[PDB]
Amino acid sequence: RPTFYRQELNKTIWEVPERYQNLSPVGSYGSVCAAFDTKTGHRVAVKKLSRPFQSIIHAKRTYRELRLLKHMKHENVIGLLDVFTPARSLEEFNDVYLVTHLMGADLNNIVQKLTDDHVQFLIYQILRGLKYIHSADIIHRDLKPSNLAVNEDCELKILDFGLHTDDEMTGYVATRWYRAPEIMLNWMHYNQTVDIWSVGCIMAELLTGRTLFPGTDHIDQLKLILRLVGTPGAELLKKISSESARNYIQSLAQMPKMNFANVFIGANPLAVDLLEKMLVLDSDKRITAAQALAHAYFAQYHDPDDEPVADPYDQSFESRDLLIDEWKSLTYDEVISFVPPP
Ligand SMILES: Cc1ccc(N2C(=O)CCC2=O)cc1
Numbered sequence: 001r002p003t004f005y006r007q008e009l010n011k012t013i014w015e016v017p018e019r020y021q022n023l024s025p026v027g028s029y030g031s032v033c034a035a036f037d038t039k040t041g042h043r044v045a046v047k048k049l050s051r052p053f054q055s056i057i058h059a060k061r062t063y064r065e066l067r068l069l070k071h072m073k074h075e076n077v078i079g080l081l082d083v084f085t086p087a088r089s090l091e092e093f094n095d096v097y098l099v100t101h102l103m104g105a106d107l108n109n110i111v112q113k114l115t116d117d118h119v120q121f122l123i124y125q126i127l128r129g130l131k132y133i134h135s136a137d138i139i140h141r142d143l144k145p146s147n148l149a150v151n152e153d154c155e156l157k158i159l160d161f162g163l164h165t166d167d168e169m170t171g172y173v174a175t176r177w178y179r180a181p182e183i184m185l186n187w188m189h190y191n192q193t194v195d196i197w198s199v200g201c202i203m204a205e206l207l208t209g210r211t212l213f214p215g216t217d218h219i220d221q222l223k224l225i226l227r228l229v230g231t232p233g234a235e236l237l238k239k240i241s242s243e244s245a246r247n248y249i250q251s252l253a254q255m256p257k258m259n260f261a262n263v264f265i266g267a268n269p270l271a272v273d274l275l276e277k278m279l280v281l282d283s284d285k286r287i288t289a290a291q292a293l294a295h296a297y298f299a300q301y302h303d304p305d306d307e308p309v310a311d312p313y314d315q316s317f318e319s320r321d322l323l324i325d326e327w328k329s330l331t332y333d334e335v336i337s338f339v340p341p342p
Pocket residue numbers: 207208209263264265266267268
């Protein structure tokens with residue numbers, strides 16, 4: 001066990017191992033400080049979780065986040081550098097701290113002057129990370145430019161996995177502009193195909209400099225979507241589980257899919273083709289991440305011997321019914337068993 005030291009930073013007590021120095025608040029589910037890690041030489045973000053075990057729902061969320069971060073080991077996905085608690089036993093266990101690489105710019109802070117070569121490299125990396133994530137049957141659910149970190153060499157990492165309230169999704173808000181229509185309107189049980197819709201929205205915005213579907217509310221956004229991709233046919237309508245939602249869709253006048261070369265004027269014809277394969281209303285028919293990596297748009301970067309998949313991931317806890325102290329004890333076991341990366 002390392003030696004810990006205590007300090008108050010912005011009305012919060014932080015108790016951390018001596019290796020972490022020069023803590024500086026940078027953000028406020030928890031508070032975040034930047035620090036220098038003297039063991040690795042990296043600048044890091046240290047997150048102190050807020051009330052991690054306040055309810056069954058909160059305690060399960062804490063366990064879910066730690067399990068996910070401990071599993072992710074890929075160049076294009078955020079990984080866990082350290083996790084610690086100052087408690088010396090389960091009996092006194094109350095606080096959880098998570099340590100990651102400190103990220104600078106996100107994709108918004110780049111969306112600069114982008115060549116087609118830049119768009120190829122950025123979207124390639126998102127898809128490489130998503131192939132890995134999806135191979136473990138994980139769905140990110142919240143892909144958008146602010147959840148993508150990018151450095152000076154155009155290297156990218158996915159962060160902030162979906163672990164959002166009704167209020168946060170209301171109105172003219174970027175928190176909804178990248179969501180697939182079937183999850184935005186609760187059409188049906190969703191799966192990993194929702195993330196590919198989000199990639200299509202991000203790629204379009206890199207090519208044009210503008211948000212693809214900046215709706216002022218849920219219904220305005222649906223109308224923007226259906227104008228581009230067309231109204232649904234009977235085949236997709238049968239897959240929408242709510243009679244009310246089916247009824248609403250049928251109230252709209254029918255529209256054909258638009259010509260994407262006349263929307264994305266001047267774009268690489270291979271980029272236009274890939275967008276048509278991502279932005280498909282019926283999620284059963286969207287291209288997958290593994291299939292998209294082999295698309296000719298990425299010919300300069302695709303290497304099928306360097307696009308790895310994940311170790312198997314056990315999510316059986318998600319259907320388990322436990323008490324607060326049982327989720328807390330499971331979380332404690334995961335804290336003390338952590339083994340740092342090389
Ligand atoms: C409204 C709008 C704005 C930009 C673009 N565009 C592309 O899609 C590739 C290069 C370019 O300028 C197309 C439409």
